[PDB]
């Protein structure tokens, strides 16, 4: 199936167009050929500086009927200065704004890291690390409940949260909405098998992030592994006549994982939607979670000694 049913009663397409990194200039028309080719999720946040350039995109595929809005999957995502509770909604609507949208198919806390409020994205001390908020997350949480109620976004969740930080969520007292999704880093380098059993287990939708090893991140070094240049990910695809990209776009999907590649090459958005007509054996599946090295992408020095810094955890 296309979609896979979440804990709000609504149904969230599997495949959807990662933004981060996507150039201002360029993800304008990746959104709109992702759209033509048959996307009707796209992955967004206020971080990723582009929502207005992808509202764009959304607003002129609309304004065409080449989609309904009720036919679109729209995330975004609340960055880390934004969560004292009463800064909440209006990152939502700056985000609605941006995004020409007057609701949110999906809102999800972007980390469990809270920062000092301001302009900056990563607001520093004088000596290089990050500020951070006095807030609990319980009551950022408890915000997030309130842009349900006022008809902000059908859904709320949570994002690079590990197990015992996605539980103190599920155990707030007065607890009123589930985070519908848990969205993280996974792929081949990093299996995530214990968050990922731990979620599903609570009904949780977890959704694959950086599914190519995100080549582009800016961090990234020569010596570095290389996903997409695997041998032996490479010998699986050929084996179904597929890409390495497509196998691993399909790994997620057969672990009932929603996934998000991002690209702004139109020939790579339609290659990476092109998965729903193949299927990885068991076997493949096993063989692929065997290539597990603990690997990330993505974290952050400047942020490891912020109290709710979410990998020092074993998940
Ligand atoms: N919640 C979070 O904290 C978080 C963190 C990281 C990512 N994310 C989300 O997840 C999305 C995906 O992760 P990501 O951007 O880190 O990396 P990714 O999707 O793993 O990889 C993107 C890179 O792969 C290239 N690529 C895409 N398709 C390809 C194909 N078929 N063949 C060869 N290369 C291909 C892209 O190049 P071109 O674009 O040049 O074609 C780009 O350099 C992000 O964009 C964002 O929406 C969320
Ligand atoms: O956060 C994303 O979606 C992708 O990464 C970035 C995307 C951006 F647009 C900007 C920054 C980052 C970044 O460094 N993230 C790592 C991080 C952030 C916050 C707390 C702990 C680790």
Request: hydrophobic letters at 35%; a neutral charge; glycine letters at 6%.
């Amino acid at each position: 199936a296309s979609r896979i049913l979440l804990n709000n009663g609504a149904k969230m397409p599997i495949l959807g167009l990662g933004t981060w990194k996507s150039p201002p200039g360029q993800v304008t028309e990746a959104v709109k050929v992702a759209i033509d080719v048959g996307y009707r999720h796209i992955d967004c946040a206020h971080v990723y500086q582009n929502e207005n350039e992808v509202g764009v995109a959304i607003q002129e595929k609309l304004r065409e009927q080449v989609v309904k809005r009720e036919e679109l999957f729209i995330v975004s995502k609340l960055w880390c200065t934004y969560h004292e509770k009463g800064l909440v909604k209006g990152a939502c609507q700056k985000t609605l704004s941006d995004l020409k949208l007057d609701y949110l198919d999906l809102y999800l806390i972007h980390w469990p890291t809270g920062f000092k409020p301001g302009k900056e994205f990563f607001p520093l001390d004088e000596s290089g690390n990050v500020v951070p908020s006095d807030t609990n997350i319980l009551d950022t949480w408890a915000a997030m409940e309130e842009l349900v109620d006022e008809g902000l976004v059908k859904a709320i969740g949570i994002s690079n949260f590990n197990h015992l930080q996605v539980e103190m969520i599920l155990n707030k007292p007065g607890l009123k909405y589930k985070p519908a999704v848990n969205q993280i880093e996974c792929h081949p380098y990093l299996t995530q098998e214990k968050l990922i059993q731990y979620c599903q287990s609570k009904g949780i939708v977890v959704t694959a992030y950086s599914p190519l090893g995100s080549p582009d991140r800016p961090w990234a070094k020569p010596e570095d592994p290389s996903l997409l240049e695997d041998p032996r990910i490479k010998a699986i695809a050929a084996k179904h006549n597929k890409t390495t990209a497509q196998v691993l776009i399909r790994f997620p999907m057969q672990r009932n994982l929603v996934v998000i590649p991002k690209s702004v090459t139109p020939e790579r958005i339609a290659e990476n939607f092109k998965v729903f007509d193949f299927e990885l054996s068991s076997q493949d599946m096993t063989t692929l979670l065997s290539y597990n090295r603990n690997w990330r992408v993505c974290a952050l020095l400047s942020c490891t000694s912020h109290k709710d810094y979410p990998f020092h955890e074993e998940f």
